[PDB]
């Protein structure tokens with residue numbers, strides 16, 4: 001436990017309130033704008049694991065419900081009231097932006113298709129120009145070797161993905177507490193060999209902060225190349241559709257998925273009869289919009305049929321995996 | 333707006349309607365089983381009726397109560413039931429509460445009057461009864477409540493005649509988990525629709541219809557019990573039933589499909605007593621103003637003169653028409669009854685009872 005001072009750094013809420021952990025009060029507190037510039041912001045983004053990335057940083061009114069105001073190189077000056085009455089909020093990467101049947105170009109720029117032996121197998125989401133979030137059950141033995149996998153981005157049709165024109169995968173990381181029987185902690189990370197070039201067709205999606213204040217039945221979206229029938233062929237074109245969150249206690253009741261949903265899971269879809277919500281495939285994105293930013297909520301894990309009553313979709317809960325991802329991105 | 337005929341004669345020695353005696357009956361029904369009675373060919377006194385029953389309020393819609401006194405009607409229709417104390421506001425015209433949605437809907441297009449009254453509490457005995465035949469067919473028996481509790485429905489559901497709420501024993505026995513209760517359905521009915529599914533490593537996970545219950549159903553389009561509001565003149569179609577409580581687990585063909593009493597949902601009750609009296613509601617419907625032989629005795633009748641040698645319209649002892657009148661001596665009136673008929677031409681003469689004079693009747 002060689003902890004020089006204590007803990008690390010995070011962002012809070014849908015406005016990216018910069019918060020730090022104090023070893024003396026044992027709690028999280030925001031940072032005052034007083035004596036803050038851009039060079040200090042790059043020290044915070046590198047700390048979480050974003051490396052050379054940096055986007056913006058300003059001061060706003062605090063809404064994190066905090067009272068007391070203000071690791072390595074810890075400028076610890078605690079107080080109780082900020083001067084100029086401003087807390088600093090910074091963004092480390094430009095994400096959560098998109099355009100404004102079939103999906104249009106630029107509508108879901110973070111979606112990718114992952115191939116093995118020149119055929120689509122799973123899907124994933126882009127967070128940084130080198131990192132991709134997918135599902136752990138896509139990479140069981142023998143598909144743990146990173147050489148099997150290639151990625152395609154910015155392309156909507158399968159017939160347009162030609163052998164040898166996909167980005168090579170450098171390494172894959174499953175979650176250390178995965179279990180194939182129960183599908184608990186079904187999440188995995190993939191790292192590319194050369195970074196992508198962002199544009200109007202390829203952009204990343206923001207990871208979720210704490211204190212999102214999501215509604216009981218929040219409106220969300222899914223996308224992918226999945227079939228309309230559970231045994232059908234992969235779709236040639238990319239599709240998307242709307243879904244609603246379903247509270248865990250309801251999803252865990254006797255008449256749905258009796259005692260099968262864990263704290264690392266989340267349900268979304270419809271409990272009624274004939275609504276086609278099978279557009280996505282394994283590891284695909286589940287996103288929602290709030291404060292004009294798109295956030296990654298889950299990766300598709302398992303289900304039971306297509307457009308069947310009582311049987312929604314189950315996803316990996318990204319919010320509870322944010323720390324593990326920040327640690328893997330930091331250990332370059 | 334139909335005018336009274338120029339000459340008019342009522343039928344003597346008709347019996348009294350005795351409307352107060354029916355409204356004051358001590359076996360008072362609840363709104364779930366509201367009762368109806370039709371009055372015609374009798375005499376009634378509105379001022380005396382409004383007093384013999386202890387009236388708190390009396391008002392009419394599309395009609396003025398002053399227009400009732402002294403008039404005749406073709407028939408008068410009355411519906412009645414007791415009022416749960418907490419639901420009295422449901423009876424306002426146009427309200428969408430529980431009483432008019434699932435028990436008794438007040439017709440607003442006809443000429444009607446609403447009457448609120450009460451009875452002494454110690455004499456009243458409430459009669460609660462379920463009118464739904466499909467509820468009774470599958471195990472609903474009676475209520476067990478206090479002598480002043482008044483049942484009312486909250487939701488009503490309807491089904492075809494082929495309905496049965498139990499699962500098939502052939503299906504249920506092959507379920508590996510989440511097995512539904514099963515029994516045999518009557519001949520002519522169809523079995524509850526069920527399905528066997530798989531998820532993760534589980535197989536034969538059975539799922540049936542109307543889950544959790546028909547009021548909160550996740551998938552109403554595939555549940556046989558359908559929500560429905562009561563129309564004018566109808567009663568509630570029936571309480572919804574929890575199909576997961578119909579039949580028995582591992583039940584075979586020596587058990588007939590019946591539902592337990594806690595399976596019938598969507599109803600409640602409340603007392604009608606306040607200040608030692610139980611409150612009651614009644615609805616009047618007035619059919620055929622200025623016609624028929626259901627007449628009021630509230631005003632003295634005018635002895636209109638039988639106009640002779642003129643083309644006149646008449647309403648004589650319930651029969652209407654148009655013709656000319658000519659008085660004749662008794663030798664030429666060939667009958668003893670108050671109306672004189674042709675073999676098929678109907679009225680050809682009549683005898684006035686208030687003056688014993690006799691007349692012939694010709695066409696205009």
Ligand SMILES: *[C@@H]1O[C@H](CO)[C@@H](O)[C@H](O)[C@H]1NC(C)=O
Nearest residue numbers: 491492493494522555556557
């Ligand atoms: C009887 O019920 C079935 C479904 O249970 C429905 O399709 C049918 O329309 C009903 N009968 C009639 C005459 O509508």
Ligand SMILES: *[C@@H]1O[C@H](CO)[C@@H](O)[C@H](O)[C@H]1NC(C)=O
Nearest residue numbers: 376377378379380629630631
């Ligand atoms: C009917 O009411 C009148 C008052 O308008 C009253 O004088 C009369 O006695 C009553 N007749 C009967 C039979 O109740």
